[PDB]
Structure 1
Amino acid sequence: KTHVQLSLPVLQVRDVLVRGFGDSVEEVLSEARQHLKDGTCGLVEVEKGVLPQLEQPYVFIKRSDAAPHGHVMVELVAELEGIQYGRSGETLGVLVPHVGEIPVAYRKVLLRK
């Protein structure tokens, strides 16, 4: 399937134990896609002061369309030193590994895979 229905645990930035997916744009997109498939991917909602508490490169989920079955269609865009690899809509949040942090909510998305 080109798209997969996922429910992503929304984590508070100060709870996150592993604050990024790796060290290159290509690695973080790779790792983010693997964790999304394995159900080991969390979402941090971007507000003032969140991104400097996480590790670059960042992986964003961005709205790719204007929401089948409640699930917003999203795609991945990475960012490193102010350059983004990908072009998409509004940021829903930044992806991080999930290693058992208690979420505050769940974000239903349809992921272009």
Structure 2
Amino acid sequence: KTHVQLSLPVLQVRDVLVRGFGDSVEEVLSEARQHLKDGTCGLVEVEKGVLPQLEQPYVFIKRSDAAPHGHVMVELVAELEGIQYGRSGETLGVLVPHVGEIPVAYRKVLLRK
């Protein structure tokens, strides 16, 4: 399928044990995709003070459409030193590895894969 229904665990930034996916734009987008497929991807909601606590490059999920079965359509956009790789809508949050942190909520998304 070109799109996949996912429920992402929403994590508090201070709980997150692995604060990014790797060391290059290409690696973080690769790792983010693999973790989304394997069900090992969490979401951190972006507010004042959140991003400086996480590791660059960042991977955002961004709203791609203005929501089948409650799942907001999103795509991946990476960021490194203020340059973004991709073009999309509003940030739903930043993706990180999920290694067993307890979530506060779930974000239903439909991912263009």
Q: Determine helix, strand or coil for the equivalent of 1:74.
A: strand
1:42-80 deviation line (CA, Å, top 9, x unaligned): 000000000000000000000000100000000000000
Alignment of 1:18-37 (within 5 A): 18-37=18-37
Matching residue of 1:46: 46
Distance in 1 (alpha carbons) for counterparts of 2:22 and 2:40: 15
Note the residue ranges of structure 1 that are not aligned, 5 or more in a row.
none
Deviation (angstroms), 1:18:
0.0
Q: Determine helix, strand or coil for the equivalent of 2:69.
A: helix
Note the residue ranges of structure 2 that are not aligned, 5 or more in a row.
none
Q: Determine helix, strand or coil for the equivalent of 1:33.
A: helix
Distance in 2 (alpha carbons) for counterparts of 1:72 and 1:40: 19
CA RMSD of aligned residues (A): 0.1
Divergent runs of 4+, >2 A: none
Distance in 2 (alpha carbons) for counterparts of 1:67 and 1:56: 29
Deviation (angstroms), 1:17:
0.0
Normalising by structure 1, what TM-score? Answer: 1.00
Matching residue of 2:101: 101
Distance in 1 (alpha carbons) for counterparts of 2:78 and 2:39: 20
Distance in 1 (alpha carbons) for counterparts of 2:61 and 2:112: 10
Matching residue of 2:4: 4
Count of equivalent residues: 113
